Amino acid sequence: PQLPEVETIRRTLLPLIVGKTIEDVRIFWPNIIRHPRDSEAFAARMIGQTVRGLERRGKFLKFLLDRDALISHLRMEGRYAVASALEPLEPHTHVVFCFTDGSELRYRDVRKFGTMHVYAKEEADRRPPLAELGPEPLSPAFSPAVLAERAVKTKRSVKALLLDCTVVAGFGNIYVDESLFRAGILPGRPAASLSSKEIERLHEEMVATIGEAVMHLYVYGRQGNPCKRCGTPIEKTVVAGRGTHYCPRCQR
DNA sequence: GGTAGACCGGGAC
DNA sequence: CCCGGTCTAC
Ligand SMILES: [Zn+2]
C-alpha cells in the first residue's frame, strides 16, 4: 500500500479496534517481528493492553496501546482485517491479535515482507523504524526550503533524493515518478542541478500528487504508451535502482 | 555520505 | 533473477 492507502487503512481500522483489549497474540512467521527480537516477548507484552489510538507516519502505522506503541509496515502487499475468531484465517496470515470480545486484528502478506516493532510509547519515536524518518509530505515541516537544503548537499539524482526516507516520509516509487513528470523534471537529473524554481515546482507537485490521492497515472507503468500531455512514448529505465518512468519531452 | 546486502515469492525468462 | 521499501553492514 502507498501512503494515501495507508492513511485510508488508518482511518477505517481505528473504529474497528479502538477500546478493545488484547487477550492473545499469535505469530505464524516470527521474522515479521523486529522488536523485541524475541517474538515471544512481543506477544507477551501486548497481552492485557487496550487499543487507544492509531496514527500514521510515512507508510508506518502506529497502534497506540496502554503502555506500548506497535509500529507496523505493510510493504507492498500486507493487509489488515478485523474478523471473528470463529472463522478460518485467510491464506498468508502471519500475525493475529485476539481481543477479549472474540474479534481479531489479522495481518496477512503473500510476500511475507512487512515488519512490526513494539516499544514503550515514549520511546517509539526515537527508535527504529521511526527514528530519522523525514517530515510528512503534507506537513508544513516539509517545505521547499527543507527540500532545497537536502538537494544541494548531495550528488545523487533527484529521484534518489525523493526516495530517501530521511528527506520526506513514505514517498514511494510511483509518486516520485508521477511528481517528477508533473514538475517537468528528469528523474536522472543531479539533485544539485535543480534551480530554486524547479525545487518549488517539485515540492508543489509532490504535495498535490500525494494530497489528491489521500483525498490515473501519467507515466508509471505506461512505458511504450503515448504521454497524455504530448503524445511522446513514455520510456522506462533504471534510476536509483528502481523502475523509472518518464516522458523524454515533458521532462528536462 | 554513501552503497550493498538483507528480507520475500508471484510472475516472467 | 527481478522488484519493491527500509533497515543493518560496511
Ligand atoms: Zn510528454
Q: Which residue is nearest to nucleotide B9 (CA to C1')?
A: A111
Please, where in chain A does CATH 1.10.8.50 lie?
133-252
Rg (C-alpha) for chain A, rounded Å, is 20
Query: In whole angstroms, what is the distance from residue A121 CA to residue A66 CA?
Result: 8
Please state which CATH number belongs to domain A1-132. Answer: 3.20.190.10
Window A44-103, strand B contacts by Cβ < 7 Å:
none
Among this protein's residues, is A190 annotated catalytic?
A: no
Residue among A185, A177, A161 nearest A223 (CA): A177
Which residues neighbour A12 within 8 Å (Cβ) at sequence distance 6 or greater? Answer: none
Residues facing strand C, Cβ within 7 A: A 58-60, 73, 75-76, 111, 113, 128-129, 132, 163, 165, 170, 172-174, 238, 242-243
Give the position of cell 548537499: A153
Query: Which has the closest alpha carbon to A29: A84, A69, A78, A68?
Result: A78
Backbone angles phi, psi at A223, to 5 degrees: -55, 140
CATH 3.40.190.10 is the classification of domain A133-252: no
The CATH 3.20.190.10 domain(s) of chain A lie at 1-132
Which experimental method was this entry solved with? Answer: X-ray
- Report resolution in angstroms: 2.0
